[PDB]
Amino acid sequence: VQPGQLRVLEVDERLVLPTNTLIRLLVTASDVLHSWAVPALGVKMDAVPGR
Amino acid sequence: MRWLYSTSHKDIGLLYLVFAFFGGLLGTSLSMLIRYELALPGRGLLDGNGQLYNVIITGHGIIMLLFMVMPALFGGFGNWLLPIMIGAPDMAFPRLNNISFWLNPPALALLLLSTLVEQGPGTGWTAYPPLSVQHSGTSVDLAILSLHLNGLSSILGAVNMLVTVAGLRAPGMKLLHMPLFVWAIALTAVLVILAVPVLAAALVMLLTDRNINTAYFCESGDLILYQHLFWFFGHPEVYILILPAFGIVSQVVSFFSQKPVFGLTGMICAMGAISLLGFIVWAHHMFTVGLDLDTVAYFTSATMIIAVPTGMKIFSWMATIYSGRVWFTTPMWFAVGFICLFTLGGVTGVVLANAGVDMLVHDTYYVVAHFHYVLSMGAVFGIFAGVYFWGNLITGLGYHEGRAMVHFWLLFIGVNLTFFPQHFLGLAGMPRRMFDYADCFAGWNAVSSFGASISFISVIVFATTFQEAVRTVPRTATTLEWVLLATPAHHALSQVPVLRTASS
Amino acid sequence: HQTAKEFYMEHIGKRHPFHVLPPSPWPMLAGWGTYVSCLGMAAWFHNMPTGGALMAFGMANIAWTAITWWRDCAIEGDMGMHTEVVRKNFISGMWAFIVSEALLFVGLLWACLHLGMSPSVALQMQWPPVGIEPIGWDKRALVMSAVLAASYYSANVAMVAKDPKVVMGALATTIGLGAMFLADQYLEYNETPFTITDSPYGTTFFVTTGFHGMHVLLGSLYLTAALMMYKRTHNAGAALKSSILYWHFVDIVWIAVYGIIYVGQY
Amino acid sequence: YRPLGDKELWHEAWMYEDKFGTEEDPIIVPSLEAERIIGVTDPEDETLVVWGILKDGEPPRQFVENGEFYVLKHVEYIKKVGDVLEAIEG
Amino acid sequence: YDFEHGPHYLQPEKIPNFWSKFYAGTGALYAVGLGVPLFAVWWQQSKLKA
Amino acid sequence: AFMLYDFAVGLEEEHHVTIPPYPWMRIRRLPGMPWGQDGLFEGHPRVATTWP
Amino acid sequence: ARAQIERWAAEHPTAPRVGRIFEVPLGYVVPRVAAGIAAAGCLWYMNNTFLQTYRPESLSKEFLEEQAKIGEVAQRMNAPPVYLNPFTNRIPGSILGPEDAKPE
Amino acid sequence: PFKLPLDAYILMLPITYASAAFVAMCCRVPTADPETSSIAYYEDEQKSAAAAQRYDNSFKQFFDARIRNHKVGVFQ
Amino acid sequence: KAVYAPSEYFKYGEGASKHFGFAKHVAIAMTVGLGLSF
Amino acid sequence: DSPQPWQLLFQDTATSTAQAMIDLHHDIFFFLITVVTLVFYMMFQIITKFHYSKVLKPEKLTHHTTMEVIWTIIPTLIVVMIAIP
């Protein structure tokens, strides 16, 4: 990382989402279980292969 | 030959106590590597190995859950103290009691052998598929077979306990005159018999998925089914580990207050309500897996009900201390500490029950701080309260009171400074089961790793408390093990005591 | 030895009606046999050479230890160490073991109910999956239900009879009826047009029916062992009653197994 | 003797005696040894149990307050009441 | 001492050199229980460093 | 009587209903079986090989 | 209830009964727990000093001073930068970022 | 065995409530939308949508008038 | 002259709870807790 | 958005849902503070006022039906007050 960025938390390609808009997020996985958690948005849903 | 072929309950209980001490030592050793990897940001002593960190946390959680608290409270104090407390001459099945103990060293050996095979079983203590199924090798099979052997041990022990309480009581003694430790052990046995075979079925399905190419939890299966079965087992499991602590705290608080237990039938009813509610609330561990909102709604509403019986038990203990003649000793401080610090472990459980709040703090260190309040400070304090209470009867050795107070204060300081900062980490969003964290989480991580070393030092200081005992003669007591000599005979209660009801 | 019986009568037998055992070597040997068999099973899962032989060796040692343990229990019964309250406690322990086996089967059938009721997109949401030809209730499974109900009633005969010939004949009929339930389950396992590796239906069917067949075999062997103790002294005590209780438990389990898997197609 | 209905036949009565042990007339506890543990409930509370130890050759001893007095007596046989004296039915 | 028929099943003031063997056993127990995880860490990390 | 009738009408009938290799048929997460290639108790494999 | 108390007090003679809540005097307890805390601190310091295989470059003082120059500011690849966590740092709602502020 | 005290029935009211709610939740699942062993259940769009909206609205319709008013806290 | 059991308890009210003031202490605790919560 | 050093409570929010969750948490904490204060203060006073240097011999107090019903019924009202939001 470089100054102004956060260690561990930084990615190379972000996810761009508009505001004031109803967005449907479909969470899934390919090999094992995961979980998509963003504590600012209050979203934490597990990524299950098949669901 | 005495300690390999035993049929006496007092020897098997002491073997359980020693085996539980060994499991506590192994888990404390595994817990220092966790807090020493987590002291500073970056890569610590594990050289950036994540598989090894996962193996370490898996082994630590399984050992401290199953091979420390369970053999100490259920197998240890239960086997030694149950037939003396009810007046039974022995257990109902004395050779079944020995195979109850002797299936535990093969299970611990298989669990420790799984760490040295392939890359180990890095799965967590819950062992969720398909992470458990993806692991090539043999280690996961050894860990699950260790779980099977421990479960069969607990089932056989509960069978012996339940037939002993039902069918070998003293004449004149009904299910009203038994002390609360007996009630706690009996309800624990009921929970074990009802809950452990569900885990056995779930792990059989896991074995067939791993090795037989079946379709229980796979591409064409259902991965939420494993979490359903596992937590239907696993939430009664945490009340199995806490009810004997309630019984011990009742006995200790009653003794040194010079008073009987306040609200005896209320105590038994609260323990029974806790036992019954533990089987219908299990999906409070599954708020974020994608269940329908009605299921989440019910499990939120049902989980908050368990607070009322526990609050009655706590207020009844406080009323037992109320209006007494209290003498504060070392086991007394381990019970007052239980009452004051299990409350801090239960109030955060109320917060975790509400599924809206649980969307933020699931798989964070808020959960960890909660369940180390209710286990490292509810169950460990219960274990250590009875060691300084019944120790001269069980082992024959006295203890120095000053070094025991030193050990208590060291443990009390070291656990209030390890897990109290883990609340703030979890509220700010630090995830569980991770060894490298963000740069801003450094202060509370440093404080928690400072507390863990104080805990380790208190573990070391405990070995220096034992000394020689002074033996006296009994006349009268309120429980049947305080009229025995220390140590009692190999066949204690040479004549079976009877309870005579007076003309009143 | 000659004063060992005298000491027992002076200190244990004349003071309480419960049984106090001498020290025994079988629990430790059974535990380390479980250790050896678990190592062999884990080696046999992943096709390690000489792993299946090691698993069979550990299982043979556990079987021998249990057989000698049960022979010791039978010897202790024949020398009159068990009073009536001890035999009541034996039936109580059998009831607790039955409750544990019941919750094991409840957990097993929970999977059938979950997987059969809501098929997934991986199965193209069709239950039963295409290709799978399920086993019908209007066939050999109904004959099995009839035979096992007859075994229930014949085991119920031997519980209440007082003529020893009636008890022995009823027990032999129950054991022979149990053996026909397993020899025909083998024919189902040979004629069935699917595998345990073919879909969650085949998986749940084979695992649940195999656990039930293992319990049938254990109950048949326990009823056989209770009969030979009666063929010798015309008295069995708790061995007859607990084996009949276990057999009735197996019969009740088959009702749920048949009515969930064979009828409900789950 | 108290009513022996709903009493197990091997409970060795003396516990089922129809007497309140006084100082001038204690309840005689039979024993196979020189000392024995017995349990006495509170006369004002059935839930409270006090266990005491009686010794052979001692004065009468009271365990709970306002309770019965007791004297131990060493015997070679204890009447297993339920088939010892109600089979006698004297 | 007679553990089976004496008054006490455990007479710790009558084993000769009791306090030496007791501290030796306690030290061995602490050594094994605090050193088995370190051996497991050393064993897995010595296989990667090959 | 019906079971003795069943013991004589056993392994005589045949099915030639080959099954295509669907994703839920013949799961092979690990190659082969611990006892060999085919399943246990399976003498007549149904799922088709050489799926045209 | 009193007799078992007096019996336990005889089998544990090192436990004092002097008429105070903390029966063992604090002159015995405080130095020994202080020594234990000191030993724990030495173990913690030894772990911090001698048991690290990778110290992150984001904790060096050059990185820290260059970060403190910037502040709690996040860049965007599609927009002007934004102040992070505006409620705790009390940014008013009119101000969204550093560059969009353009101070008067 | 003993006489249950006056607390334990105040205990048994939410316990009976929880047991009844558990039985109802178990019962109403095989009478819901995705518990159909066929792809031909959804080709009838009117009945499928009606059944699914019925499963939606039950136990939620008791909360709509306070969802709309942001009654999501003990205090406001 | 026999061995007498001693008087082991007072009745609730004439011992060392007559000067406790239970309701006063509960009111003080609830006041402090409500002040912190507010 | 991002966590901060020496942080105690939650992060800042960008949705109304997460702010509702945080407000529910603080509403629960309102009750928890009073519960913990009552327990800790009553434990301290019971400890200090019933030491054996103050007490000649204890009092017989096994049951109190009114107080048992009171501490059974007050937390259930708190549970149902929490549950509906």
Ligand code: HEA
């Ligand atoms: C029995 C429960 C128990 C106990 C007592 C402890 C005790 C401790 N634990 Fe934890 N811990 C768990 C249960 C427990 N733990 C579980 C279930 C996990 C999850 C694993 C997983 O995710 O898979 C976990 C994981 C866990 C984590 C999270 C790591 C991660 O998320 O990756 C941390 C972090 O701080 C931690 C630290 C500690 C510390 C410093 C102690 C200290 O208290 C140190 C211990 C000190 C003691 C004093 C206890 C020993 C007791 C005795 C020796 C008494 C025996 C005496 C007799 C028998 C007479 N352990």
Ligand code: HEA
């Ligand atoms: C000792 C074992 C033990 C005990 C007793 C408990 C007790 C409780 N637990 Fe917990 N719990 C665990 C062990 C235990 N737990 C473990 C090991 C995990 C993590 C598993 C894993 O993933 O690894 C866990 C996780 C866990 C979760 C899942 C969170 C998650 O993983 O995402 C939840 C959710 O409901 C929960 C809640 C509760 C509640 C409500 C109680 C209640 O029983 C507590 C009741 C007590 C009180 C509430 C305080 C006393 C009451 C009063 C003084 C009256 C005043 C109260 C009110 C007015 C409400 N705990």
Ligand SMILES: [Cu+2]
């Ligand atoms: Cu839980």
Ligand SMILES: [Mg+2]
């Ligand atoms: Mg999770």
